[PDB]
Amino acid sequence: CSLDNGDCDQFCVCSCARGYTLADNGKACIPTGPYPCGKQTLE
């Protein structure tokens, strides 16, 4: 993980925070609701 965060989008084997699920590729993270933790809100 010491390089480019193991090519992860979140926790690094990648992973993510509650309210997210790891995308198929196993690197990006997918939000499970309209208001996931850590994202600025859009109207």
Whose Cβ is closer to another protein: residue 26's or residue 37's?
Answer: 37
Interface residues with another protein (CB under 8 A)? Answer: 1, 5, 9-12, 17-19, 29, 33-43
User: For residue 37, which of 15, 20, 14, 12 has the smallest C-alpha distance?
Assistant: 20
Whose Cβ is closer to another protein: residue 24's or residue 42's?
Answer: 42
Burial tier of 13 (Cβ tally within 10 Å: 0-12, 13-18, 19+): exposed
Smallest distance, Å, CB 35 to another protein? Answer: 4
Smallest distance, Å, CB 30 to another protein? Answer: 12
Residues in the chain: 43
